[PDB]
Design an enzyme around this catalytic site. Sequence first.
Site, PDB file in Angstrom:
ATOM      1  N   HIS B  54       0.863  -1.176   0.000  1.00  0.00           N
ATOM      2  CA  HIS B  54       0.000   0.000   0.000  1.00  0.00           C
ATOM      3  C   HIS B  54       0.912   1.244   0.000  1.00  0.00           C
ATOM      4  O   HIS B  54       2.008   1.152   0.579  1.00  0.00           O
ATOM      5  CB  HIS B  54      -0.879   0.160   1.242  1.00  0.00           C
ATOM      6  CG  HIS B  54      -1.805  -0.983   1.486  1.00  0.00           C
ATOM      7  ND1 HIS B  54      -1.365  -2.164   2.062  1.00  0.00           N
ATOM      8  CD2 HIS B  54      -3.132  -1.173   1.246  1.00  0.00           C
ATOM      9  CE1 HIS B  54      -2.400  -2.997   2.145  1.00  0.00           C
ATOM     10  NE2 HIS B  54      -3.506  -2.430   1.662  1.00  0.00           N
ATOM     11  N   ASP B  57       2.238   1.891   3.389  1.00  0.00           N
ATOM     12  CA  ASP B  57       3.202   0.987   4.001  1.00  0.00           C
ATOM     13  C   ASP B  57       4.630   1.467   3.669  1.00  0.00           C
ATOM     14  O   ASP B  57       5.582   1.187   4.395  1.00  0.00           O
ATOM     15  CB  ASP B  57       3.117  -0.414   3.429  1.00  0.00           C
ATOM     16  CG  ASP B  57       1.805  -1.090   3.640  1.00  0.00           C
ATOM     17  OD1 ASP B  57       1.119  -0.894   4.659  1.00  0.00           O
ATOM     18  OD2 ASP B  57       1.427  -1.859   2.739  1.00  0.00           O
ATOM     19  N   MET B  88       2.468  -5.886  -7.917  1.00  0.00           N
ATOM     20  CA  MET B  88       1.132  -5.372  -7.649  1.00  0.00           C
ATOM     21  C   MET B  88       1.338  -4.270  -6.609  1.00  0.00           C
ATOM     22  O   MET B  88       2.270  -4.345  -5.778  1.00  0.00           O
ATOM     23  CB  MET B  88       0.229  -6.452  -7.111  1.00  0.00           C
ATOM     24  CG  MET B  88      -1.158  -6.021  -6.669  1.00  0.00           C
ATOM     25  SD  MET B  88      -1.239  -5.431  -4.957  1.00  0.00           S
ATOM     26  CE  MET B  88      -1.451  -6.914  -3.994  1.00  0.00           C
ATOM     27  N   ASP B 255     -11.995 -12.140  10.019  1.00  0.00           N
ATOM     28  CA  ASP B 255     -10.989 -12.421   9.002  1.00  0.00           C
ATOM     29  C   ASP B 255      -9.682 -12.826   9.667  1.00  0.00           C
ATOM     30  O   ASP B 255      -8.948 -11.966  10.184  1.00  0.00           O
ATOM     31  CB  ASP B 255     -10.864 -11.185   8.107  1.00  0.00           C
ATOM     32  CG  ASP B 255      -9.935 -11.320   6.898  1.00  0.00           C
ATOM     33  OD1 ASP B 255      -9.943 -12.404   6.248  1.00  0.00           O
ATOM     34  OD2 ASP B 255      -9.220 -10.332   6.519  1.00  0.00           O
ATOM     35  N   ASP B 287      -1.601 -12.927   1.374  1.00  0.00           N
ATOM     36  CA  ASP B 287      -2.096 -11.852   2.231  1.00  0.00           C
ATOM     37  C   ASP B 287      -2.477 -12.485   3.559  1.00  0.00           C
ATOM     38  O   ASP B 287      -3.592 -13.018   3.644  1.00  0.00           O
ATOM     39  CB  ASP B 287      -3.303 -11.129   1.600  1.00  0.00           C
ATOM     40  CG  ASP B 287      -3.654  -9.848   2.329  1.00  0.00           C
ATOM     41  OD1 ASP B 287      -3.005  -9.593   3.391  1.00  0.00           O
ATOM     42  OD2 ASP B 287      -4.552  -9.096   1.895  1.00  0.00           O
TER      43      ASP B 287
HETATM   44 MG   LIG Z   1      -6.347  -9.457   0.538  1.00  0.00          MG
HETATM   45 NI    NI Z   2      -8.496 -11.323   4.885  1.00  0.00          NI
END
Ligand SMILES: [Mg+2]
Ligand code: NI
Lengths: 388, 388, 388, 388
Positions: B54, B57, B88, B255, B287
């Site tokens: 990001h 970051d 990415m 999550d 991730d």
């Molecule tokens: Mg993700």
């Molecule tokens: Ni997640």
Amino acid sequence: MNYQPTPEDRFTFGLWTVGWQGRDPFGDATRRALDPVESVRRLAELGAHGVTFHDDDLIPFGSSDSEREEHVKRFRQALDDTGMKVPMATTNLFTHPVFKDGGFTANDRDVRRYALRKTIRNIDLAVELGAETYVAWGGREGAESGGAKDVRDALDRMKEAFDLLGEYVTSQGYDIRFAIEPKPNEPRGDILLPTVGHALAFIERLERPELYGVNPEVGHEQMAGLNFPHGIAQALWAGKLFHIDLNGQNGIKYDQDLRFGAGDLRAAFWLVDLLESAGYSGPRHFDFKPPRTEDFDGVWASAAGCMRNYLILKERAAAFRADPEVQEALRASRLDELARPTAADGLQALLDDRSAFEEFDVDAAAARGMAFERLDQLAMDHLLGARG
Amino acid sequence: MNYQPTPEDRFTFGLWTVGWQGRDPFGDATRRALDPVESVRRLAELGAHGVTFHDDDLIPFGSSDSEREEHVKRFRQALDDTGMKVPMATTNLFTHPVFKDGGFTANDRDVRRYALRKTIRNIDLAVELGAETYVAWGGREGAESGGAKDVRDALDRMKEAFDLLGEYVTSQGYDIRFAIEPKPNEPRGDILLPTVGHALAFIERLERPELYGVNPEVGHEQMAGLNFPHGIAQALWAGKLFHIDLNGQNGIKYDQDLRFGAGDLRAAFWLVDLLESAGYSGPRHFDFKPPRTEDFDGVWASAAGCMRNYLILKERAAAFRADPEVQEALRASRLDELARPTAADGLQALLDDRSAFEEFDVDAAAARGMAFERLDQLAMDHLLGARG
Amino acid sequence: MNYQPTPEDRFTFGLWTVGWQGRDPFGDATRRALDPVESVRRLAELGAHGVTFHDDDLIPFGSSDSEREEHVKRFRQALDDTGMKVPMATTNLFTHPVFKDGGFTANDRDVRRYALRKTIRNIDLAVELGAETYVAWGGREGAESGGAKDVRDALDRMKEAFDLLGEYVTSQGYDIRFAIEPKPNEPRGDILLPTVGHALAFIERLERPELYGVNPEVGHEQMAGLNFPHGIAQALWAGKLFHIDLNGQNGIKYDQDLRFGAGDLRAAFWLVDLLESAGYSGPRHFDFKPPRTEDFDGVWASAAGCMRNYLILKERAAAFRADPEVQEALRASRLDELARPTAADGLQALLDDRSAFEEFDVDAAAARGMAFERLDQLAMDHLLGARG
Amino acid sequence: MNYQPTPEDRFTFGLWTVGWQGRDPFGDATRRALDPVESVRRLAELGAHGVTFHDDDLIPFGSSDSEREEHVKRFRQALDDTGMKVPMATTNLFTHPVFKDGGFTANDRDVRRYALRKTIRNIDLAVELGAETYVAWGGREGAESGGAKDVRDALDRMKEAFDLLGEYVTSQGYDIRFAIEPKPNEPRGDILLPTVGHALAFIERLERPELYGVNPEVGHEQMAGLNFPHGIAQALWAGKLFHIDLNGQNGIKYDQDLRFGAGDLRAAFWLVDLLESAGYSGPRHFDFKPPRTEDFDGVWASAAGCMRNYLILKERAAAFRADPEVQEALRASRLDELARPTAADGLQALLDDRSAFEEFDVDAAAARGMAFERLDQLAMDHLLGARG
Ligand SMILES: [Mg+2]
Ligand code: NI
Ligand SMILES: [Mg+2]
Ligand SMILES: [Mg+2]
Ligand SMILES: [Mg+2]
Ligand code: NI
Ligand code: NI
Ligand code: NI
């Protein structure tokens, strides 16, 4: 306050709903079968607008053509005697053991051709009875295990099936559209096109996408923990809400199909608010199961309650939107600003606009409260009829 | 058997993954911050191909242009010293309090313009560093309450935002595509475009759909109880799998972002089988969050384990597909028939074909078992390395 | 109709609820910290009866004894100035990194002794301030992976911890009882004693079970898809409902802690019906988080709404139970028969009773409808204030 | 590596498992009925130890005493011819329409007396056939709506029922214990005693608690999103694991009853590790449904696979625990410390111990990593047979 439905309210019911005999995975039927004619008559007396059917609800599987003709003629007379309409019809591609691995996406090619032929025969009947929408619920399209189904091949077969159905309808000159009904699971471990989003995405890959929309069911999106009014908004945004199935569901578990208003009551309120404010003009169809605890008196009480709860929520959503204090609260929460374009001035102007970045006061912006809790307590007060 | 990754395996990691300090809704950080340069070096030593970031970051929020330039120059030197790539990049539109009601779909119009400007600035940086894919995760786009967000207006704003981004990229002549990352909830009560299907459907309404794909994350579809390999198959079928985020999740809850292979292990097997048999050629991006129980040694052990589990599952899926007994079982379950057209002969021939309806022996068809359980036990045996 | 709370309604709030600054796993604080004194004053003005605290909400972690004394003296003056009470207190054994693997069930023995000492120090303070109930929420007791925690050893350690706390209380002669608060997950992947049932079962293995009850939270049982009013009924049946935390939750997802009345509204109705008809006499405590979208005005609006929704539901449940038509419907559904013993005549008489088996007409019994749908629509009508 | 079961492995199957005809809420049977004698013979050939039954699986509902006697005599001969045992039996109180509102907690008092009489008659039969455990699964005890069931009254009725059953067993001098099987939902909207914890808690309120334990089923706790090995640990800790039902479940949805090893494979590994390391000595019973896609060949393949997957996981758990590197990792994660008392020195010594609070270095403690990720990757490597 009373809340009597009239056929102008466009409430409709499947034959299989009030006719559900109460058989579940662990128990035998608790009610005798209902004759479709008797169901039409009882629902008309309750104020319903119309009924819907699967082929096999009306014409017993395997019926001779001549028996077929008599079932249809009696049904037609019932509709004529009561003024009831048949706005939607669908195919049973899930009960008979031949469909145990699917209809359109069965691994066996001969089963797939049979499923198409069974479907086409009922489309002709649907048109004859005046239906405007033909639903497809692929309840057996899916798998319990990962190697049983190559999903890309299965989607090719599903597209092929719907493309052939659209060719048929157009070649025959029929005025009917298709609506795909998603469900994430049950009776298969995972069902293909499990949510409104997956069905919307699939439609865009069909040869004639304008012929296809969605038929979402309240309980099905809730079986994936999703926000049903949000999914309906996306379907409305896309121009694809062709039909809708109303019922209730308590969370992520088996498909309960409770009467509408049961289950998540606040979600029912926001759904009715959205349907009425968007001016959805299609049937308000109830796909529900009177619990098997009930006798026939409780079946008709449950059916009446579906309609009653819709009309109460309609009155409360309308009072909410008309309340001047609510309109002021919507402005305090900047719903008006949400509706204005972010950059009608265009990309270049946005890039040149120092107040959008260089000189934007992020701290002052961050400090502004959204006032959503006061707005939501006004909605709660309206729902409960406690406004003060 | 050993399972050492090499950069040719295209494993990648976000800076924010191994750099997660362990702060959760109920607890303070358990680890000190990592310098991005140190992360690049450690991941290169583990055999990673590349890293992602990001904006925030890499460049601390609010940094001066000159501080900006130095952060980038040190990072670039680290990439040069190690051979690591940056395939990415993405934008943080969720941490700062100004984004508390969203970025692209915030009710406040000035916040929406700021979010676009912050995004564009990072797209330029992404291109400079060689990124091919730009991800958008709208983690704050959504609502806790029904009246806070008109979802049709919000989708208009979301479309407007992505349309402007595509105009920018095309006008600048950049070779970069966008990938939308769905998530059903958390941190908002419900997030817009909650699943792969909803994101795929939305893309078809954009002005230049070919510029946009999906970035699905294993744990996110599992937070809606969905079958992740099925959703990836639909994305592959649509030609829209531009990137993928690998991790583990134990069911429907918060999550977790566990290391890949943790959570639903059989789903991980079927996912790798699908990615390798479809020839997905993009990055295998993780991730994930090393649990906050771990010190830095456990962070690198968790990162290594992501790659290790992918390579073991790759070996087992490959052995499964190559096994002659498995190929015979696939034929016994008619997977070959699934891949053949239902009616290449066409609608008319199908309608004229008495063996598809009039003369079809439904009973004989129904009696045929699908042999799926034997097929699935061969898959289990291969996964566990127990073949006999 | 108005619905103004008074301290006689026994509504209470944790300091950490209205004081939540809005930090979530993906975002920074959106509100400044509140001084506990200011919270006491604002809540008193809203009609609250009292406040509760964790040690660390009142006395900053690591405070010197002298700083400790001043924090307590200011707080006490606030209580004296407002008439507010402190009915419950608890310990923070979850925020500091030393508790990353638990407090009472941390693998490190020295951490477990520290957790006990931190707890005992706050019990003394709780008694000084007049608290009657001491809650224990073991938010870090649990695991992300199967080998990290031997659950039988962990339960031995948990029992040991609670047994020592009961020894302390009894030896000191304190009039305080303990209440264990279950939660199924978050922040650990799975938390020990995940539901009201598991906590009730555990209590029966303690040395002095009469000192321990449960503190259930609406949202926590709902994170396991369970029926919260059913779980509270079981706790009441057992004589163990010592305290209760009220809030709202939309299904199985992260712990939302919405204001009470939000989330599952029908469950909130049946809960209030049960609490009032059982004559639960403890505090009505709200453990909720004003959403981080809100400024301080929205914080107090959310807190007021908690109390408001309780009082509206109390009025509707009372009207439901008092309605003669509802009393007739309860008899039609044989709720009166449910309350009568099955066999007060005894085993032998039951065995000798031919009408209970040999001569029982199972068909006639099976045909009787339960009339539950009509009963539930009367409940819906009462909740919505639509009775006719 | 081969994995052939023998009767010494104590694998058992219900008649209703391999005998399931494939009827589900949406479809007709796909398989013909199996004679119980044929099932006994086929399972014996596969290496099973024994079978279990509901009354109604063995003796058709309504059978005359003389027909009853013949069904039992043929069954007994089958057991004699094969060496198969009958370790457990249970009652069907869920299929017949008379049980539509429950058996022991039906609102109708006459139905409750009938349910007890039907149960007692089968207990006598169970004892005759040598069963050691009698299971009770209250699949119809519960409700779809809040006013239909007063849960405190229902728990009184449930206690009364189990108390009378214990009186019967003791008065007759029978050597049999009871095991309650929890399930959170399905076929009722919510079922009473929904989880292992709620059942354990309830048992402690019975008149003779030592006669009652739990029969947990893997899929049922998983339908509430709970950790099945953690719940079994709590049951073992309590001394109440009298029986166990093994199968597979993919998340929170309808009760799938897949073969054991399917569904959550890592949970299956940790469960077998726990059962074998605790020395659970009861039957390993499979309560599963061969999917209705299968013919009889696939039924026996699915049954064999249940046993096969248990034996593979048993070998991998054993190799994990015996591996010196794993034993070193357990010490690095302080599992040894978890097993030592927190304060065998006693309360007073703990209070006097300055190193437990006054002089405890919280920062140094917090910095220690738990090393759980390395431990969990060794477990993964062992499960996949990838150790290096
Ligand atoms: Mg993700
Ligand atoms: Ni997640
Ligand atoms: Mg439907
Ligand atoms: Mg709480
Ligand atoms: Mg079972
Ligand atoms: Ni449904
Ligand atoms: Ni909570
Ligand atoms: Ni089950």
